[PDB]
Amino acid sequence: GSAFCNLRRCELSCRSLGLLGKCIGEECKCVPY
Numbered sequence: 491g492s493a494f495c496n497l498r499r500c501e502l503s504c505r506s507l508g509l510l511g512k513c514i515g516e517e518c519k520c521v522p523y
Contacts, residue, residue: 491515 495516504511504520512519 492515494508494513495513497513500511500518507520510523512521
């Protein structure tokens, strides 16, 4: 698996929010760091 999504790019979908972003596999979460 682990195709198309970079966790580094999910981070920056989610950090704009005061969170972390965590896209392990291909499924992005944002998380209260």
